[PDB]
Every structure is written in C-alpha cells, then in structure tokens.
Design a protein around this nucleic acid. Structure first.
Ligand code: ZN
Ligand code: ZN
Lengths: 343, 49, 50, 148, 58, 103, 65, 347, 53, 148, 58
RNA sequence: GCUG
C-alpha cells in the first residue's frame, strides 16, 4: 500500500537502471505523517550494534547498524584527515651525490611511514626548528656504493657487480635524543615497511642525510594520513520479487557476483535463493537481461554500513577507529567550552 | 609537443637554456602502434589519472 | 653504427634522431622547403581574367 | 621543483585542455565502494559540443586494461572494440559501461546518478602561472620615448 | 611602432598587471580576486585627511 | 575566538542567529546539522562554507518560536558527544570480544 | 624515474612491491596474476606497477660512477 | 586582450586572496569571451579619485548588464548554472525539509548573512511533507520577507508544443507570479544570456541593477550545490546507439543509396528533369544531396525518440546549456555531408 | 520557384521564433574558433521569414 | 466551514501523452454531481492512482474547520484536530489564473480556474456558479481521499 | 502592475470607464512633456484592452 | 617560431 511505499522511501536506497532512488536521509521530525523522528538516546543505544566481520594486521572490517550517514561519513573523514601520525618534515642533506634530485629525495623520505606511536609525541610549535626529545625523532641515512671486490667477470647483474647499489628503508638508523632511548626499547621506533626503495646508487656515489620526524594531521599533508583507504558501503539487500526456477536461475546466478546467488534443486528443479548479499558488487548486469530485470529488486539498507579500514602499518587499525571517535568528541567539547566562555 | 616529460637518457648530463622534466612519468595505458614504432613508451610524458 | 653501450661513453641517447647540426653549441635543423616544380608548363588565369 | 597549483595547465590527449581551478582534500572527494576517489574531476559539459567520444572510450579501455594487466590498443581505424572491453569489466565485477555507485564525501549520502570512473592519460603542459604572473608599479623606461 | 600609433594612440602604462584567470563562483559578479603578490605591488596614493588618519597609521 | 554569534538583525532577534565556527569543515557541520535538525523546535538549520580557502563554517539556526537558538545549538553538541561516547564503548567491547573468540 | 613510494590516489605503499613484481614477471607469472600475488586488488594501485617505466637503470649508465 | 566592444573592459571591486590567479564569477565570462584554458587577463589600478568614480559609475558590471548593441543581457547564467537550474525546476523533483534547508542555506553567505530565510509552506502535506524544487528556486528571487521584489514573467520555453497555453505536456511554459515559479522549467531562454524574457533582464528594469546582480550571485551559489550532490555524468552508454536506430539506419541507408543510383542512371543515360536554371550535373547534385540529407534527418529523429530521459547528452540540448540536437544526431546516428565552401568535395 | 527552394532535407522541425513546420535549414562548421556548432534556419510556412543562428 | 468546492471525481485517463515523468502523473478526471472536468498532477510515488479509481476532492481555504484563517506559518510538528485527518492526500498552492472558455462566441458560463501546487498544476473547469469563491492570488488546500 | 498591485477592494472598470480614466490621467503635464506619438501608442493599447473587456462582458 |  502507500504505507509500504513510504517504508521503502525511509529505509532502502533502491538502485535502478538509470539512477539511484531514495538517496536522501528523510528521518527528521515532522517529515512523515505517522512517524515520530525526534531524537531518542534510548532508542539509538538499543538499535546500535558494531560487529567485527574480519580483523587482520593492517585491515579491519566492521559493520555499524543504526548509525546515520552524516555521523558515519565524519568517522571516515576524521580517519583520513584528523588522526595524527609522525612523518619526516625536514631533511638535512650533506654530500648527496646520487642521480636522484635532493628535492625529489626529500619528498620520497616524507612519504615513508614511521612505526612510532603518535600519542606519546607532542605537536611542534610554529618555528622552533631545533625541536625537543618530546616533539621529534631523528633518523640518519648514510650509504656509499662500492664495487664488490670479489666479483664474476661478466657482472651483467648490478647486484653481483655492486654493493649497496640500492638504498632501502632498512638503512635508515634511529638516533635517540635525550631520554627517548630508555622510553622506547630497541626496534620500537623503525620505518614500518623495511623494503621501500628510497634511491639507487652506482660505485663512488654517496647519500648522507639526517631526517626530523614531527606529529601532523592529514589535512596539512597526505604524508601524515594513517589509513591507506577508509571507506563505507551500505549493505546490499537483493530481493527476488517473483520466484525464479529453471535455466533462468543459472542466468540470474551469472548476472550477480560469484557467491551471492545459490541455485538449489528443491524438487530436482533448479530454484534461486539469495545466500550472501554482502558479497554483491552492484555491477547491475541484471538490467542487461530483459526478462530478469522485472523479477529482482536491487536495494541497499540505508542504516547498515560495512566499514573497511586499511592501515599503513603506523598503528593497529582498531586503535585508529577508536582515536577517530575521540577526535570528533574533542571537537564537540571544544565548542561547548567556547559557549561556556561566551556565556 | 608541449607536454612535460623526459628528453632522453643523457638529460642529466645535458645543460640547456630551459628544460622541463616530470618526476614520476608513466607510460600510456592505451596506446597506438605508432607509440611502439617511435618508442615513446621508453621515455613517456604523462601520468594516468 | 655504435651500440647503446657505446652511446653511453659519448653521452648520447640512442633514441635521439639526429638529422640536425650543432653550430656554436645550438642545435639547428634545416627544415624541408616545399617548392614548385621547375620546367613545367603552368596554364593559369591572369588577374584580368585572360 | 614545482608542485601543481591553481592556474597550471593540464591536458588530456584529446584536445580537452584545461587550467586547474580548485584543489580539494581527499576527505571531500566523492568515493566509490572500493574506496577510490578521483585524482581529477572532469566536467561532462566538454563532451557534447566537442564530440570527443575517443576520450570516453579511452577511459573504458584503460579501466578494463588495468584490471587484468593489459595495454589495450587505440590505433586509428582499428583498436580494441567496446564489445570486448565491456566483457572484461563485468568479469572483474565492475559495470560494463564503467559507471559506478558513488557516495558523496561532503554529506555521506549517495549520489543519484552513477558516475563514470576510469584512468585517463593526462599530460602536464609547460604553461605555469608562476612563470606568467607580472606586475609593474613604476619602473624603468625607454630612452627615446620616456614610456615603459 | 611609429610615434602616432606606437607611442601616442596606444601606449604602455604603469600600475598594471597580468596573470592566468581561473573560476570562482563564490565571488559576486562585481568582484575580482587579486593575489597578494600583485596587491603588495599595485599601490594607490591615499591622501591623508580627518577620516583616514587613524586607518593609514596602522 | 572560535565561535562568533551574529544575530540576523540590528534588533538582535534571538530566534535567528548565525554561528561562525572557526577552524571547522563539513565533518563537524554535517554531523551537528543532523543532530540539531532532529530537534522539533529548529525550523531551519544549514551550514555554508564562505570560501574553500577559509576554514570557517557559518551555521544558521532559525527556531520555531521564542527559543534563543543558543539552546538548540548547545543541545545538538551535547547529543553528538553522547552518540560518540556510546559508539566508542560499543566498538571497543565488540573488538575485545572478537579477539577473545580468535584466541 | 624510480617507483613512486605511495600510490597517487589511494595512498597504499607500492615502493616495496617493485622488486617482487619484477621477479614474478621473470618467472612464468602473468602480469595480472603477478599484481594479484602482490595484493594490489584496486585498479588505482595496479596501474602504478603496470604503467611504471624504470628509467633509473638507463639514466645510471650515463652517471659518473 | 582583444577588445571588440566596450564590455571587454569593466571595473571590479578587488578582494585579496592567497592564490596567484585572477578569479571572477563565471557569469561574467560571456562579456570577456574568456574560457579558463590558460587564458590571461590584464588589470589596471586607477591612480586618481576622479578615475575611480568614472570607472565605478560608468564601467561597473552592474551598470553594464546589457550590451549597447541590441540591448540584450550578457552577464547571465552559463553551463552548470542552467543545467542545475533546469534539473532543479523539473516536475519530478521533491525535497523533504532536511534537504530543502540544506540547499537554501547555501545562499546565507556575504550580505545575505543577516536575513531571515523564509522557508515557504510545503506543497504536499498528508502522505509526506514535500517541497517541489520550483519553490527552492523561488528563494533566489525573494529570499526574505522584507525583500520588496515582486518579479513577473510569462514566456514560452524552448520545447513548447505550441498549443498547451500553460498546460503543455513538456512543462515548457514559464509563469513567475510574485517571485514564485508557478510552472515551467528554466532554460537558456529564461536564465541565460541569449535574449530577453530572461528573469534577470526583467528584474534589472523592474527592480534596478542592484536587485538583478544579487539574484545572479544567489543562483551561482545554489546551482553548483544541487548538481554537485545530485550528480551529472556522461558515459559511453549515453552515446551508444540503441537497437531501434541500428535497424532503422540500415533500412534508411539502403533505400537512400538505391534511389541515388537511379538518379545517377538517368543522367548517365537519359533524361533527368533539369531543375529551373541549372545544368543536368547541377541537378543531379541537388537531387542526391536532398536524398542523403533526408536520410540523415530520418536517422536523427529515430535516435532521439528512443533516447531515455536522464541521458545526459539529451538534457544539455533541451536546456540549451551546451550542444544541440544536430550534435547528438551527429555522434550517435549519422555525420552529415561534409561540405567545403558550400559544396561537395572538389576534385 | 518554391520547390526549387525547398529541395533541401529539413521539414517539421522547430525554430525559436515562430515554430512552423515548413522550414529550410543550414549547418556550418568552418570556423574552428567556434568550438560549438553553427546553424542557420529559414522558416516559411506562414511566410514569416526568420533567419537566425 | 472554509470550503470552496467539493465533489466526487472519477479518473478517466492517467497519461494522455505518455509517461513524461516518474513521480508525477497527469490525471484527467470527470465529476458525477456537476459537469466538472479536472486536470490534476499528483505524486504517484507516495500516492498511487489507478485508471478506474473514484475519489473525493475538497478544496478549502483553511485546514481548521472552525474557520480561523490564521496561517502565519504552517508547523508540521504541531498536532491538533484538523480537516486533513479525514483525507489521505493534501497539497498547498495558489490560485493564479481565472480564464474564460473561448469555445463559444455567445451566451457562455464555463470558467477555468488554475491552481499551481509548487509546479504541480490543476485546471478546474465548470459552471461559474460552482467555481464561486475563487479569486486570483488566493491560497488553497487541496484534499483528496479515494473511495472504495 | 495587475500582479504587483491587485486591488480586491476596488471595482472593475467597464470599457467606457477605462477610456475616461486614461484620458483624465493623460491630460497631466508630465505626459504632455513625453512625445505625442508615444502617448498615442498608449491610448491605442488602452483602446484595445477596453474592446477586450466589452467582448467578455457581452 | 610560438603562445595568448
Ligand atoms: Zn591505489
Ligand atoms: Zn522563423
């Protein structure tokens, strides 16, 4: 009925052949005739649930149910831009004789990630270049390329012919400042990857440099961003409007992603059921087939968001999500303090 | 003719009035046969966006 | 007739086309000039339509 | 060493030249389901008047190419056909015409229209605003006519 | 380039500038954004009087 | 000096007020707009960025009746803080539970 | 000239993968399968290894040494 | 740099901003013939109080909204301000209270920061509370209750059928009564620079130059925000020929080719009625050209009939922001006879 | 003659002036400063006789 | 009361010139009690209308039956007994053109009233005695309930 | 003018009344200052409107 | 010579 039509309008975003309908969030007070949309903290608490679908080092997948898009988008935006990390800001260069330009070499070093925990360090004040034990980490890279004394005659391969031909992030060595050495045990502060190729050298060429690492947010530069990518997708809810049986099931299974549709022979006759809608990639190839277009509805549940966070290895991914929630809470607190100061 | 790129392999031993280079050039993801004849994909001028 | 390993001793690029001069350190190309064929009977109209 | 700023000319191998007009953060870009957000947003209004259908095919052939480790050919009077690359995209789970379900980075709500997404070769042109900004208050003058 | 056209009918002028143009829809139609590097050079002679003395001091 | 409140008119009518929030972007404004638009009293709430260059958001709250508009804005900030506190606790409990099952 | 340390759009570290990718290609591995083994699932990351031209080796032949 | 008329040099109020380029609102691109493709423009700072006044009063943009030539407006809406306005004012658009406010709140910047915003009463009440997008557009023309503007306009849109008289099926008849848009979508002919019947021109004369300028500024803020958040894109699907055209073209081409051969046969061996004033060869060219051009016209109509609404190329042609039905038909159906100096290709 | 005038393709289209079906169209492109297309139309059902771009 | 007009209408056509829009359909209707023809746009997503349906259409000057024309602003949140509790669909719009029948040269009584509901148009055409109380620049509530 | 100033409290003039009222206003000096040809065009337009009022009222 |  009309009540059914409104329920879809407020609960499902429907993907269509030419456009996506019901895109806007409409659950605000007075927008509907029979529904109360005023904020209820008790209702939000009861409905909200976070489920960890998968967690592996450097990747976290979790589902937030009952949260709104605006709050969810903030978490993704905070993770990408407002969670702090440590990265090289100033490179002091002595004796750089490599082909790579010093400005290019400085940029490459800034991009390399550091395993130091940002919460321990503090933001450097404007200027104040010298820095302190609390606000900075110092790394020294010194590599000189030399011919291998014992080498084969052909020496076609550079690796056999030269020693230290390639500068790798393993070469960078932490220089402790003040009490940092005691606070951080050996190996806690190191470049995360260990294999990134900073530069390539030939015999007689040397790179000597000192790098200062400072706390920063992603908004200032992308080098400070802690996540390779943070994104959210609403949960797919494919529904077959009419029962589909026979060879049609095989084509319907082909139209969708590999595991979403499973065809079962209930009476020795193939019948199609939706088993794992989460796997659907929404290629919308069903619309290409004229007969099946009317037998299926492609929709996304609006309030169920599957969040995927892949870290750069600087800190655990679960900690990153927790920090992002804290940063948003902090922004609200700062404005409340300003309101108290005004009044 | 005006795109920044790579003049050649001697470009670092070359002193010119004005030279432009792109730092991280990439070869075209879609290419002609003419690109393979003139060897443009050896010293390319552009990046895939 | 050099090989690419011997262009490296001369600081030259194997892909560099040549076809140009170096005169007082600037690279100068003689462009191809298009011309009319001499010794051919043109038959054409004058300004006055003759 | 120069980094791209407002007023730097970029071009795109089909005569669709265009100066940079705005630089926006990654947090404000629209993003796909996979997390991809574009390096460049190009205005659709260029294509109808100019009929650069080859840019629309280059985006599609390239996308089908990066997803399976191929270089698709674009040779004149030949090249890889649309019918072949459409079947490569659906095999890798993308839509056959490259349009994707895109979420707004500002509001978090999804966009109504599907947005065309792909890799397009872009070449940076020598014309940079830093080498072209000029101002004179008063200054040196010619000797014959005492004018600037 | 003769005096009549080059030096009289059309002539080079000072307090002038040139740059690449780019869009900005958040400006009003009567406004133009001028970069700080041009604004620090292009000066206007403000005559000191009772209405602007305390402004020009700053 | 992060928050400057500009009243709509010289009369300083409290019901319509624009809050200019410094060092802010869509992340706080869009989240706050949703929380303060779930208040029945707020007739109109919207945020506008004056220019991409300046990091300031102007948030305009127009109330239905005599409410000063500071009260709806303050309530919205309080609600956002409570929503964040609940999500953090629920997320941490779920993460700990998952690790325990893995062990 | 040298492999970019981070993917331009996504921001994944792709500097570590260049040496492995060259080795996988030296073996029978296909270009698509080699990228799959490295773990470059998204198209943005795959193009960086697939479209990269390594000129550092060629340029170094002309370097002083 | 190249000045063909007086509007190529105008006076603007400076505002200082950090980035190196000169920047202005794209509504003023049409007087300068500027296109933002690495274009450069000159700036002059008048060094005298008398030179400020002559620049401000005589050469100000608000004093120069209309060209001296035919008296038509040149500072008006352009692409993405015509397309966004067209898609907003279509009959299919309905907004709830949350999205109505978030589109309207974009205008609350600058001198409009002090006004009370005047959200209008909703159209649909009982099943749902919806605002039709025409109401949101009307907030451009009167954004607050104290604003005196009462605009009136009544004109034919671009795709008017000619018989509807405000009841047309295309929704292409415009009525703006007391600054409220009662019917019709906004096309180039109503918001653009082409000609009169343009709401901006009507405001100019009726409510003065300042009121007209304010509206143009307000639309520029509102239009990008709707389009940016609705999304407009063009893809190979949009320009892909559908099955109907693919059959029709084969039939039309075969028929046309056969007819041309017959005409060719007559000239070669027989009587081709020589058209008045022309040689037989000339006549053959004319008959052949018409058949070919007729085939092209037939192949174009078919494509438009099957192109679905929402095809982006079609929208830009209808609202007139960029392109035309020739361009659509030329890249989908059939490129025309290629003509050099008004004739078929010379030997 | 009128038939010597209307032995060109177009009929039953729409002009922006008088909307009449009996028409006489033209298309040009030979100015590549004009990146948009160029058209000119004649419309003579009611003998109104417009000729615009 | 504050009722201007009230009659039962039968739907006679749904789309005369095809489905030009998704949400909106152009209902052509005819009334039993009086000889009134009705053109009406309705949102057929929220409220679906079929080709045989019969509905009751009231046009009212005020939504509160006590005849208080106090409408400074309309508050959706406020809940009091009103006329809309008896009706399924409600629209708010303005009467903007009253126009005479052109189709007879003498002794005519048919009038057309045009109402615009934010762009959703209504033409109500009938004898002048039934359209009494319409005036230009007046604001009216349409109310509508389907009958079994 | 009809839409900006609708006057619900005033009577609707007949064809004769509209012509008479226009003539009384036209006799004022400010109208005389304007060119007579322009005044004639206004009178012709008013006469056309008056004819339409009669046709309807008949 | 090229950009405008
Ligand atoms: Zn990537
Ligand atoms: Zn005409």
């Amino acid at each position: 009925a009309a009540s059914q039509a409104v329920e879809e309008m407020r609960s499902r975003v429907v993907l269509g052949e030419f456009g996506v309908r019901n895109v806007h969030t409409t659950d605000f007070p007075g927008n509907y005739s029979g529904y109360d949309d005023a904020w209820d903290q008790d209702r939000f608490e009861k409905n909200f649930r976070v489920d960890v679908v998968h967690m592996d080092e450097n990747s976290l997948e979790f589902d937030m149910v009952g949260i709104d898009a605006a709050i969810a988008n903030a978490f993704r935006r905070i993770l990408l831009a407002e969670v702090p990390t440590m990265a090289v800001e100033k490179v002091l260069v002595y004796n750089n004789t490599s082909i790579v330009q010093d400005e290019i070499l400085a940029h490459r070093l800034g991009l390399i990630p550091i395993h130091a925990d940002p919460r321990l360090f503090e933001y450097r004040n404007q200027g104040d270049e010298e820095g302190t034990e609390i606000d900075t980490l110092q790394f020294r890279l010194q590599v000189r390329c030399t011919r291998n004394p014992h080498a084969a005659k052909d020496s076609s391969d550079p690796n056999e012919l030269y020693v230290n031909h390639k500068v790798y992030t393993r070469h960078m060595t932490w220089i402790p400042l003040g009490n940092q050495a005691d606070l951080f045990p050996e190996g806690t502060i190191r470049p995360v990857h260990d294999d990134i190729l900073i530069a390539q050298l030939r015999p007689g060429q040397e790179i000597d440099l000192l790098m200062h690492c400072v706390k920063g947010i992603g908004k200032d530069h992308a080098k400070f961003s802690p996540v390779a990518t943070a994104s959210y997708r609403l949960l797919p809810d494919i529904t077959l409007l009419e029962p589909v049986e026979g060879e049609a099931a095989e084509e319907l299974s082909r139209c969708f992603s590999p595991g979403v549709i499973e065809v079962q022979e209930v009476q020795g006759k193939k019948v199609a059921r939706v088993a794992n809608p989460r796997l659907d990639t929404f290629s919308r190839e069903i619309f290409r087939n004229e007969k099946l277009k009317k037998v299926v509805r492609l929709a996304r549940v609006r309030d169920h968001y599957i969040f995927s966070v892949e870290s750069t290895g600087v800190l655990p991914p679960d900690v990153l999500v927790s920090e992002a929630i804290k940063v948003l809470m902090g922004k609200c607190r700062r404005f409340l303090d300003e309101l108290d100061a005004v009044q | 003719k005006q795109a920044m790129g790579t003049i050649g392999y001697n470009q670092r031993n070359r002193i010119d009035t004005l030279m432009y280079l792109l730092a991280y050039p990439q070869k075209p993801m879609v290419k002609t046969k003419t690109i393979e004849l003139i060897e443009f994909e050896k010293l390319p001028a552009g990046q895939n966006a | 007739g050099k090989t690419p390993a011997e262009f490296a001793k001369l600081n030259e690029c194997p892909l560099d086309p040549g076809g140009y001069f170096i005169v007082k350190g600037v690279e100068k190309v003689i462009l191809i000039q298009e011309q009319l064929s001499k010794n051919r009977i043109i038959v054409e109209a004058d300004r006055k339509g003759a | 060493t120069r980094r791209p700023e407002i007023g730097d000319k970029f071009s795109s191998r089909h005569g669709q030249k265009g100066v940079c007009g705005l630089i926006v953060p990654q947090e404000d870009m629209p993003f796909c389901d996979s997390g991809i957000c574009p390096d460049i947003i190009m205005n659709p209004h260029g294509f109808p008047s100019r009929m650069t259908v080859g840019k629309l095919i280059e985006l599609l052939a390239g996308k089908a190419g990066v997803l399976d480790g191929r270089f698709h050919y674009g040779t004149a009077f030949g090249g890889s056909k649309v019918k072949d690359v459409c079947e490569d995209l659906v095999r890798h789970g993308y839509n056959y015409l490259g349009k994707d379900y895109v979420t707004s980075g500002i509001t978090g709500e999804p966009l109504e229209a599907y947005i065309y997404f792909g890799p397009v070769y872009y070449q940076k042109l020598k014309h940079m605003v830093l080498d072209k900004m000029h101002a004179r208050a008063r200054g040196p003058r010619a000797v014959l006519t005492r004018q600037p | 380039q003769g005096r009549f056209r080059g030096n009289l009918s059309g002539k080079r002028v000072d307090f002038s500038g040139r740059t690449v143009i780019s869009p900005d829809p958040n400006l009003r139609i009567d406004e133009v954004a001028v970069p700080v590097h041009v604004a620090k050079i292009l000066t206007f002679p403000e005559k000191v009087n009772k209405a602007n003395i305390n402004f020009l001091r700053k | 000096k992060t928050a400057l409140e500009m009243v709509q008119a010289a009369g300083t009518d409290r019901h319509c007020v624009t809050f200019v929030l410094h060092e802010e972007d869509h992340t706080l404004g869009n989240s706050l707009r949703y929380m303060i638009m779930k208040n029945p009293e707020v007739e109109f709430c919207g945020y506008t960025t004056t220019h991409p260059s300046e990091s300031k958001i102007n948030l305009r709250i127009q109330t239905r009746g005599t409410l000063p508009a500071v009260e709806p804005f303050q309530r919205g900030l309080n609600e956002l803080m409570n929503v964040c506190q609940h999500v953090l606790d629920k997320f941490e409990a779920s993460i700990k539970d998952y690790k325990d099952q893995k062990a | 000239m040298i492999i970019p340390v981070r993917c331009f759009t996504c921001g994944k570290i792709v500097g570590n993968k260049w040496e492995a990718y060259l080795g996988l290609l030296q073996a029978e591995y296909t270009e698509g399968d080699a990228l799959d083994a490295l773990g470059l699932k998204r198209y943005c990351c795959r193009r960086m290894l697939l479209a990269h031209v390594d000129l550092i080796e060629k340029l170094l032949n002309y370097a002083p040494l | 740099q190249p000045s063909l008329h007086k509007l190529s040099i105008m006076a603007h109020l400076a505002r200082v901003k950090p980035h190196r380029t000169f920047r202005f609102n794209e509504c003023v691109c049409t007087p300068y013939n500027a296109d933002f493709d690495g274009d450069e423009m000159n700036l002059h700072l008048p060094q005298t109080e008398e030179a400020k006044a002559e620049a401000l009063v005589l050469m100000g943009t608000k004093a120069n909204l209309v060209t001296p030539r035919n008296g038509e407006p040149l500072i008006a809406a352009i692409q993405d301000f015509l397309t966004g306005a067209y898609l907003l004012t279509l009959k299919d658009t309905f907004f709830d209270r949350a999205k109505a406010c978030q589109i309207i709140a974009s205008i609350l910047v600058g001198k409009d920061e002090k006004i009370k915003v005047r959200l209008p009463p909703p159209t649909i009440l009982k099943p749902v509370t919806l605002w039709t997008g025409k109401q949101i557009f009307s907030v451009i023309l009167r954004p607050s209750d104290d604003n005196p503007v009462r605009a009136n306009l009544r004109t034919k849109g671009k795709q008017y059928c000619g018989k509807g008289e405000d009841l047309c099926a295309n929704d292409s008849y415009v009525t703006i009564q007391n600054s409220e848009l009662m019917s019709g979508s906004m096309d180039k002919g109503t918001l653009g620079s082409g000609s009169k019947n343009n709401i901006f021109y009507i405001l100019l004369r009726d409510w003065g130059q300042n009121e007209a300028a304010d509206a143009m500024s307000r639309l520029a803020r509102l239009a990008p925000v709707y389009l940016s958040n609705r999304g407009f894109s063009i893809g190979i699907g949009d320009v892909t020929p559908g099955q109907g055209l693919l059959k029709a073209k084969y039939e039309l081409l075969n028929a046309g080719y056969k007819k041309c051969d017959e005409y060719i046969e007559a000239l070669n061996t027989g009587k081709l009625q020589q058209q008045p004033g022309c040689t037989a060869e000339e006549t053959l060219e004319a008959l052949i050209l018409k058949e070919l051009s007729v085939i092209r016209d037939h192949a174009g109509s078919a494509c438009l009939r099957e192109l679905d609404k929402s095809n982006s190329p079609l929208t830009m042609a209808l609202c007139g922001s960029k392109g035309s039905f020739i361009n659509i038909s030329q890249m989908i159906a059939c490129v025309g006879q290629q003509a050099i100096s008004g004739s078929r290709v010379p030997d | 003659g009128a038939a010597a005038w209307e032995n060109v393709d177009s009929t039953a289209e729409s002009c922006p002036k008088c909307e009449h079906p009996r028409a006489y169209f033209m298309q040009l492109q030979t100015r590549s400063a004009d990146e948009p297309m160029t058209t000119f139309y004649k419309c003579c059902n009611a003998q109104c006789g417009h000729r615009w771009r | 009361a504050g009722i201007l007009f009230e009659d039962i209408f039968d739907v006679k056509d749904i789309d005369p010139e095809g489905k030009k829009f998704d949400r909106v359909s152009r209902l052509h209707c005819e009334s039993e009690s009086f000889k009134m023809d009705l053109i009406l746009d309705v949102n057929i997503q929220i409220y679906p209308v079929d080709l045989g349906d019969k509905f009751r259409l009231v046009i009212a000057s005020t939504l509160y039956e006590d005849g208080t024309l106090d409408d400074g602003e309309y508050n959706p949140t406020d809940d009091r007994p009103s006329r809309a509790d008896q009706f399924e669909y409600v629209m708010y719009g303005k009467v903007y053109r009253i126009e005479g029948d052109e189709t007879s040269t003498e002794a005519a009584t048919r009038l057309s009233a045009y109402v615009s509901y934010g762009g959703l148009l209504m033409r109500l055409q009938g004898d002048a005695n039934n359209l009494h109380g319409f005036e230009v620049d007046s604001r009216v509530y349409l109310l509508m309930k389907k009958l079994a | 003018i009809k839409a900006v100033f609708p006057c619900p409290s005033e009577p609707a003039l007949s064809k004769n009344e509209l012509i008479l009222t226009t003539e009384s206003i036209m006799k004022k000096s400010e109208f005389l200052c304007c060119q007579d040809s322009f005044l004639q065009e206004i009178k012709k337009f008013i006469k056309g409107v008056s004819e339409k009022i009669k046709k309807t009222r008949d």
